[PDB]
Amino acid sequence: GVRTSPTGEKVTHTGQVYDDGDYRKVRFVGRQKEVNENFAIDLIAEQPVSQVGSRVISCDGGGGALGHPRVYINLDKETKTGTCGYCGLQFRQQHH
Amino acid sequence: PTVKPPTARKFIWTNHKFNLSGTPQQYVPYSTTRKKIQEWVPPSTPYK
Amino acid sequence: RGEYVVAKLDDLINWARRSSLWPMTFGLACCAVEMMHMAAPRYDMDRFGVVFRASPRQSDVMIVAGTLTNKMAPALRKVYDQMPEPRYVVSMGSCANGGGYYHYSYSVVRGCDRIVPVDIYVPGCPPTAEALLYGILQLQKKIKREKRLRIWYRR
Amino acid sequence: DTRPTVRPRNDVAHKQLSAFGEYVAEILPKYVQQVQVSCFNELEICIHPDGVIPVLTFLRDHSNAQFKSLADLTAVDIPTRQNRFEIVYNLLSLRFNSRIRVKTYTDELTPIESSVPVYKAANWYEREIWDMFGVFFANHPDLRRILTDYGFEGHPFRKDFPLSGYVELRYDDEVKRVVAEPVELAQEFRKFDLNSPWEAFPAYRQPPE
Amino acid sequence: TYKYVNLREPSMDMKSVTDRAAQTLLWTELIRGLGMTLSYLFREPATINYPFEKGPLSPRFRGEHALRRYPSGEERCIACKLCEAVCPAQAITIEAEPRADGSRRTTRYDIDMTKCIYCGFCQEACPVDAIVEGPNFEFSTETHEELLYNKEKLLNNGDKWEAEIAANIQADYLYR
Amino acid sequence: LHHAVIPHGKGGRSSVSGIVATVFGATGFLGRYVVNHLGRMGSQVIVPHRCEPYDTMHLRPMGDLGQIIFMDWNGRDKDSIRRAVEHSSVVINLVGREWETQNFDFEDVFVKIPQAIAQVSKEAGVEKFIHISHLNADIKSSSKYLRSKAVGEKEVRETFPEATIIKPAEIFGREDRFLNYFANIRWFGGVPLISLGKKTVKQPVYIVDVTKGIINAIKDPDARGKTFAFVGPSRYLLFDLVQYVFAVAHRPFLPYPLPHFAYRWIGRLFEISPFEPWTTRDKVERIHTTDKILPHLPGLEDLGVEATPLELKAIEVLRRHRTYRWLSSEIEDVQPAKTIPT
Amino acid sequence: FAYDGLKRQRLTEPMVRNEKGLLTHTTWEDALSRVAGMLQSFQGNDVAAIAGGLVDAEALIALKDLLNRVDSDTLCTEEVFPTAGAGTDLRSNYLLNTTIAGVEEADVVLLVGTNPRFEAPLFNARIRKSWLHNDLKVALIGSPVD
Amino acid sequence: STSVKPIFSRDMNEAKRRVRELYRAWYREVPNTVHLFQLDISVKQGRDKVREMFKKNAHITDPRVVDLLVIKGKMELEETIKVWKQRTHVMRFFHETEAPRPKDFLSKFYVGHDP
Numbered sequence A: 001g002v003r004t005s006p007t008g009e010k011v012t013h014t015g016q017v018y019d020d021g022d023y024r025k026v027r028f029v030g031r032q033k034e035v036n037e038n039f040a041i042d043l044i045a046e047q048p049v050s051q052v053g054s055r056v057i058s059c060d061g062g063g064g065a066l067g068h069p070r071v072y073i074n075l076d077k078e079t080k081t082g083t084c085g086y087c088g089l090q091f092r093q094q095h096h
Numbered sequence B: 001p002t003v004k005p006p007t008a009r010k011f012i013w014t015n016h017k018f019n020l021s022g023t024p025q026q027y028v029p030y031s032t033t034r035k036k037i038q039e040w041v042p043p044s045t046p047y048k
Numbered sequence C: 001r002g003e004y005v006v007a008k009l010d011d012l013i014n015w016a017r018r019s020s021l022w023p024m025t026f027g028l029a030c031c032a033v034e035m036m037h038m039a040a041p042r043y044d045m046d047r048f049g050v051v052f053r054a055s056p057r058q059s060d061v062m063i064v065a066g067t068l069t070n071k072m073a074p075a076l077r078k079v080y081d082q083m084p085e086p087r088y089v090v091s092m093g094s095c096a097n098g099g100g101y102y103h104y105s106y107s108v109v110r111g112c113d114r115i116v117p118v119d120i121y122v123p124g125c126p127p128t129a130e131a132l133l134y135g136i137l138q139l140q141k142k143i144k145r146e147k148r149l150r151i152w153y154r155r
Numbered sequence D: 001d002t003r004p005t006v007r008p009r010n011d012v013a014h015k016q017l018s019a020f021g022e023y024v025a026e027i028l029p030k031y032v033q034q035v036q037v038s039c040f041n042e043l044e045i046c047i048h049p050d051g052v053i054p055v056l057t058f059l060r061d062h063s064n065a066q067f068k069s070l071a072d073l074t075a076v077d078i079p080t081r082q083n084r085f086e087i088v089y090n091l092l093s094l095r096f097n098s099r100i101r102v103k104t105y106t107d108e109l110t111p112i113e114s115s116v117p118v119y120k121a122a123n124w125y126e127r128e129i130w131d132m133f134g135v136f137f138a139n140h141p142d143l144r145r146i147l148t149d150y151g152f153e154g155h156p157f158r159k160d161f162p163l164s165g166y167v168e169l170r171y172d173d174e175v176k177r178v179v180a181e182p183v184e185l186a187q188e189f190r191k192f193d194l195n196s197p198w199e200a201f202p203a204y205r206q207p208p209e
Numbered sequence E: 001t002y003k004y005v006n007l008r009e010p011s012m013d014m015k016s017v018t019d020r021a022a023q024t025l026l027w028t029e030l031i032r033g034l035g036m037t038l039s040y041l042f043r044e045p046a047t048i049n050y051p052f053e054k055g056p057l058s059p060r061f062r063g064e065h066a067l068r069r070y071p072s073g074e075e076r077c078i079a080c081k082l083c084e085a086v087c088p089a090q091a092i093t094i095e096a097e098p099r100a101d102g103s104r105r106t107t108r109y110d111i112d113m114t115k116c117i118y119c120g121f122c123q124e125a126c127p128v129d130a131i132v133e134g135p136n137f138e139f140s141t142e143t144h145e146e147l148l149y150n151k152e153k154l155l156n157n158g159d160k161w162e163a164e165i166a167a168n169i170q171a172d173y174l175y176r
Numbered sequence F: 001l002h003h004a005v006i007p008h009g010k011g012g013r014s015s016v017s018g019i020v021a022t023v024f025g026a027t028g029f030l031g032r033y034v035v036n037h038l039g040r041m042g043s044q045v046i047v048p049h050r051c052e053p054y055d056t057m058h059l060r061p062m063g064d065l066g067q068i069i070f071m072d073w074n075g076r077d078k079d080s081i082r083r084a085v086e087h088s089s090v091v092i093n094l095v096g097r098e099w100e101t102q103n104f105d106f107e108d109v110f111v112k113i114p115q116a117i118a119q120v121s122k123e124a125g126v127e128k129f130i131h132i133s134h135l136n137a138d139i140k141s142s143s144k145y146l147r148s149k150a151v152g153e154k155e156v157r158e159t160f161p162e163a164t165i166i167k168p169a170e171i172f173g174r175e176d177r178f179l180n181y182f183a184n185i186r187w188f189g190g191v192p193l194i195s196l197g198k199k200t201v202k203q204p205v206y207i208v209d210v211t212k213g214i215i216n217a218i219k220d221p222d223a224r225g226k227t228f229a230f231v232g233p234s235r236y237l238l239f240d241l242v243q244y245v246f247a248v249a250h251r252p253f254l255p256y257p258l259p260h261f262a263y264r265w266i267g268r269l270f271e272i273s274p275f276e277p278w279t280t281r282d283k284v285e286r287i288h289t290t291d292k293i294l295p296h297l298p299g300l301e302d303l304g305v306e307a308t309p310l311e312l313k314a315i316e317v318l319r320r321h322r323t324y325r326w327l328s329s330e331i332e333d334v335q336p337a338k339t340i341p342t
Numbered sequence G: 001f002a003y004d005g006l007k008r009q010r011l012t013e014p015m016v017r018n019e020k021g022l023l024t025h026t027t028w029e030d031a032l033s034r035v036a037g038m039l040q041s042f043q044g045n046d047v048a049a050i051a052g053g054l055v056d057a058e059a060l061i062a063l064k065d066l067l068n069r070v071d072s073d074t075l076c077t078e079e080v081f082p083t084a085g086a087g088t089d090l091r092s093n094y095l096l097n098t099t100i101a102g103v104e105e106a107d108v109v110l111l112v113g114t115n116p117r118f119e120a121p122l123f124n125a126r127i128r129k130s131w132l133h134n135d136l137k138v139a140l141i142g143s144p145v146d
Numbered sequence H: 001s002t003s004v005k006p007i008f009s010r011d012m013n014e015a016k017r018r019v020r021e022l023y024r025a026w027y028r029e030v031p032n033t034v035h036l037f038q039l040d041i042s043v044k045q046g047r048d049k050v051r052e053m054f055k056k057n058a059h060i061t062d063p064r065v066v067d068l069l070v071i072k073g074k075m076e077l078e079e080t081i082k083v084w085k086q087r088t089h090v091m092r093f094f095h096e097t098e099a100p101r102p103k104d105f106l107s108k109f110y111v112g113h114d115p
């Protein structure tokens, strides 16, 4: 999420911000600091975990050829959910 | 768009902004990476 | 009131300058081809009042359309200097903006802004004839917001 | 030659060029050092630097050559060779609808005779070679820089000349003119090591050192 | 096969000589040139009323760059650096690190729009349709610095033009 | 700052000098040279301007991308002063007018504005402050310009005790109003000089020398709290100087004396101009004010600058004042003017 | 993997003690002037130097020459080595004379008071290779380390 | 081995003649150059610069290298006489905008890492 540093400058999704003594803050005087307010780390975390019945599931990102290369995710571990290395969607095997 | 509207996404801007160059809303480039080398901070108490 | 009058006089000279822009006949590389198409019938820059004239002494705008090399850089500064004021520079294309495809060449100037001041930067390689025309109409709006006389009135 | 993706061979032209390569080497043994024909049917004659005027004159005037057009003339810089420069002449024959390549060599200090007497087209190609490589052509009608800026020092197309050079230009308001200063780059050119550590073409494997 | 363009012998009969005499003295072939420009004066001009009308474009148009997201809001870019390796102008600078959730993501994604040659090689090489050239071309600026796009500026462009960008990829991805 | 900006590079356009400088009055004669030198070595320059942005265009090519930053400011608005100095390490005040307007007078320009800048600079945490006074600034001066210079000089020395005060002589250069001023008197036929210009002594200093002294005062820690007098290497009578200006410009020199009171009446006549006045009463007083000799103050030689003689650079300034017949005349064609022995 | 330690706790500016007794940043001119003032005021045994573990030969000789300009010979190291007998007069006294590649030719190796697995990981790997391929006989006098 | 094709001069004695001939051409040209280009330098500064350029290569003993230097020098002279060069090209020999870089070890030490 977008949060402001004590001096008031916004912090980007990469965690970048200028210190209170950094002369480079002069570039924002009379202008604005461009910051994207839709942090991708928050939005992916809002997606529900998909329940599946097989030990191995495939993700192409949705949209077929408009997604990402099809990869196969192993769901044998019960402690954690299998995560797509491309798009971050999580899958869990039904009742292990 | 009135006959075939665009797909709806919750991250698409609801309000369109025209070219903002020359105004206070213009874009100012900056580096989006954090500092790389951390300097040593001397102790704040005299050794003596 | 005096502030009202200088405001209206400012609106008059600003109008006259943005409605009668005369670019210098000056093109360097491929970007000048796209500048020709802005004079071609489809876009017809002449209908906005924009007329090319070859003499730098009768030009109001310099469009740096193409690559600027070290050999040509003294020539560019000379023709820019020989332009009576007020004079505006429009930088067209990646080469004239920051070197473009030839940024790392021994013989290329990394941006025309190292040689002359630049008022509008038009991106592209080349910018379409309609993208250069956007920069010209963006230059006209810049001239429309000048406050030469108002700033004089309160000196 | 029925394979869709492979380039078909023209073995009729390969024999003809090989036959004519021997023909030239038989007539000019004083200068011809090596003849070869590539797999895409391009004949190359490699000569001693002294044979530039005799070889090209024969190839332009002999009734069985008639190479009346100088397609191009250029140099290649190979630092590892004792003679680092390789002068390449690409000739075209309109009479016989054929092409031939004549190659010689030189170094930083050895001149090569100018071929303007043989081909008027070589006037500017030799200026470009001198300007971009520093190879001097003797008896050239007027030899000087053609592409580089006035007063430019060095030869850009040498392999040891840096890509961005040594100097760059800006405008200085104190002296009211364009000045030249040592090159500083806001972003350094990023060198990519693209070569794969696995051999690609066994046919060209050089004998082990 | 060849043809001659200017190998013709004029007739020498008295009627042909007089015809050429009338052309010389009465400027007939110059009057004919006037008639061609008079015809254009009465044709409709080809000018369009910009900016109220726009020149036609196609879904393949290569305009301003943008970074896209998946429908869930996650960034498509996974810091592979194929765009950086193929960019002919070296206009792309990328840095990456594991994100707080362990995802392969970028911390720097800069495009110097003054080095870029708007060739589209980056969107060809992207295996996840992350970096695209959008349909926008009206983004001139009053200063040089505004053309040095960073990651925040590129994500804002993607979020602004996604509605149009998605429809153009839908119209052209079968040709790719 | 304990760990200030660390310099990097070889002192070029893309290097970092570690100098973040706010230059008030950068859009004038002395400003363009200072900004050029700062930006020539890779320095962050903030340029607050009161003029139209079109009037700041010649400063843009003076620095790499993002190194020259422009802001609006008002001399009577402390908030706008604080915006433009709150991030800087050095502040250079080059604000001045040679004439009084309807809105600003010598007191407002040379006393109130410098004090406000210094006061805000101290509160903002700036460490180095460079202030440009005049050599002939004394409280007992007939020139109201030179009286305000004296008052402003002491106000700055109190508000910013560690400030560096520079007192130049009449600076000359391409855009100066000193040699151009004399060469432009040809429009009126003859040159009127009080006492025929033989009772006044001038010690003009070259613009680049003043600029390099200002830059060297930023880098030298020994200039904190000092007051420097920047003067040229040679002293001239007003007559011999003006005679030299007309000799280099190759134009007829027809001087005549004019009483002081009459010369002030001429100055009053030309003050009515609602634009940049050609001359004023104050300009006549400064022109005929003998340049002070202040051996107790450090000068250019201390900061490390070799003062450039007026004879090596007058042609660079005065060549454009020649006609076509004399444009090509070389530098070694006018013998140097008589110099008052040291 | 220890290279990442080169990005933390780095000394980047000269420092000196101020009135309060705290280290504060200063210029190179100021720092070398203080050290030069004291070095001029002392000589002989009053000046000594200690060299750490990561110091290079070029710096070692420059400091030795500098301290010899004040007639000092107290150039020490943190690592002890006996000076009894030949001391450091003969190189063979303080070297691995068989060479790392010579372990492959030895047939008996005696390790005295050393845990080579951690003191020299690559030297220990060389011993294991000789152990595996040359049937080396290894004996150790010291703590029974793995 | 050691037998090479010459360019213009067969020995240093012959080569030095071409050096002197070139020097006399440059020496006579400076007054014209300082006049046509309207340089703000003196004829003495220009002729000092020519001398500085010649003494920069006084250690050469290979006649061929000397021949190329004269060849390059004559190209420079031709560019200046015909005014192919501009005022900017003729003033690049004086480096007026380059701040004097340090020469002694201490000054180089303070500013950076370069030798």
Ligand SMILES: COC1=C(OC)C(=O)C(C/C=C(\C)CC/C=C(/C)CC/C=C(/C)CC/C=C(/C)CC/C=C(/C)CC/C=C(/C)CC/C=C(/C)CC/C=C(/C)CC/C=C(\C)CCC=C(C)C)=C(C)C1=O
Pocket (backbone or CB within 6 Å): C025, C026, C027, C028, C029, C030, C032, C033, C035, C036, C039, C046, C051, C052, C066
């Ligand atoms: C392909 O390879 C390449 C080239 O190869 C071609 C190149 O070339 C180049 C180099 C390129 C360039 C230098 C730029 C090229 C760009 C172009 C647009 C050229 C292409 C072709 C054209 C035909 C463009 C325009 C030229 C013409 C001839 C069009 C004719 C129409 C016009 C409107 C021109 C002028 C005409 C008229 C009738 C006069 C208008 C002029 C005025 C000044 C306006 C009126 C004048 C006044 C003085 C004001 C009026 C009122 C007054 C004076 C006051 C009266 C009232 C009172 C009260 C006093 C490159 C790089 C290249 O790669």
Ligand SMILES: CCCCCCCCCCCCCCCCCC(=O)OC[C@H](COP(=O)([O-])OCC[N+](C)(C)C)OC(=O)CCCCCCCCCCCCCCCCC
Pocket (backbone or CB within 6 Å): E024, E025, E026, E027, E030, E031
């Ligand atoms: C029966 C009794 C015996 C006597 C009877 C005689 C009756 C006939 C009288 C002679 C008729 C002569 C007609 C005039 C000829 C003059 C022209 C000429 O010399 O031609 C040769 C000239 C030159 O022709 P040439 O270039 O081919 O060379 C001729 C000579 N040789 C071939 C040997 C080299 O033609 C021109 O003048 C070219 C015109 C220049 C372009 C002008 C633009 C065209 C404009 C067209 C519109 C004109 C509108 C005019 C009306 C305006 C109304 C106000």
Ligand SMILES: CCCCCCCCCCCCCCCCCC(=O)OC[C@H](COP(=O)(O)OCCN)OC(=O)CCCCCCCCCCCCCCCCC
Pocket (backbone or CB within 6 Å): E012, E013, E014, E015, E018
């Ligand atoms: C019929 C039209 C009457 C109305 C025209 C009014 C305009 C007059 C101006 C134009 C000149 C046309 C008048 C000249 C006679 C034309 C008729 C004619 O010549 O007879 C036709 C006959 C057929 O020609 P043919 O045999 O095919 O080849 C020529 C071989 N001598 O040709 C001949 O063989 C006869 C001999 C031809 C040579 C005679 C000399 C002709 C050239 C003299 C200059 C004529 C123009 C003088 C007036 C100039 C002013 C306009």
Ligand SMILES: NC(=O)C1=CN([C@@H]2O[C@H](COP(=O)(O)OP(=O)(O)OC[C@H]3O[C@@H](n4cnc5c(N)ncnc54)[C@H](OP(=O)(O)O)[C@@H]3O)[C@@H](O)[C@H]2O)C=CC1
Pocket (backbone or CB within 6 Å): F024, F025, F026, F027, F028, F029, F030, F031, F049, F050, F051, F052, F075, F093, F094, F095, F096, F097, F098, F104, F109, F132, F133, F134, F135, F167, F168, F169, F170, F171, F172, F176, F177, F178
């Ligand atoms: N002959 C000389 O040059 C001398 C110079 N000095 C002093 O050096 C300083 C620099 O002057 P100089 O460069 O030579 O000549 P300039 O008059 O050209 O410089 C004046 C600068 O100060 C600004 N200025 C003037 N009044 C105001 C105001 N009310 N508010 C805001 N800015 C103002 C101007 O901005 P803007 O243009 O937008 O109004 C301009 O940038 C002056 O203080 C001068 O007294 C001392 C000795 C000799």
Ligand SMILES: CCCCCCCCCCCC(=O)OC[C@H](COP(=O)(O)OCC[N+](C)(C)C)OC(=O)CCCCCCCCCCC
Pocket (backbone or CB within 6 Å): C001, C002, C005, C006, C009, C152, C153, C154, C155, F101, F102, F103, F274, F275
């Ligand atoms: C042939 C002889 C020529 C004479 C000179 C003519 C040019 C100068 C005149 C200026 C007079 C003056 O004073 O106007 C100025 C006054 C206010 O003065 P201020 O603010 O005290 O100025 C003090 C100096 N500042 C301003 C630098 C601080 O503004 C006005 O109310 C109107 C100003 C605009 C001019 C109005 C005329 C409109 C004409 C329209 C034509 C189409």
Ligand code: SF4
Pocket (backbone or CB within 6 Å): C029, C030, C031, C065, C066, C067, C092, C093, C094, C095, C096, C100, C101, C124, C125, C126, C127, E117
């Ligand atoms: S920016 Fe593109 S189109 Fe324009 S000159 Fe450069 S390469 Fe050609």
Ligand code: SF4
Pocket (backbone or CB within 6 Å): E083, E086, E087, E088, E089, E090, E091, E092, E111, E115, E116, E117, E118, E119, E120, E121, E122, E123, E133
């Ligand atoms: S469009 Fe081409 S030049 Fe521009 S960033 Fe992409 S790959 Fe690089």
Ligand code: SF4
Pocket (backbone or CB within 6 Å): E076, E077, E078, E079, E080, E081, E082, E083, E084, E094, E122, E125, E126, E127, E128, E129, E130, E131
């Ligand atoms: S934009 Fe695409 S090609 Fe470029 S780094 Fe990201 S995923 Fe790879």
Ligand SMILES: [Zn+2]
Pocket (backbone or CB within 6 Å): A059, A060, A061, A068, A084, A085, A086, A087, A088, A089
């Ligand atoms: Zn996925």
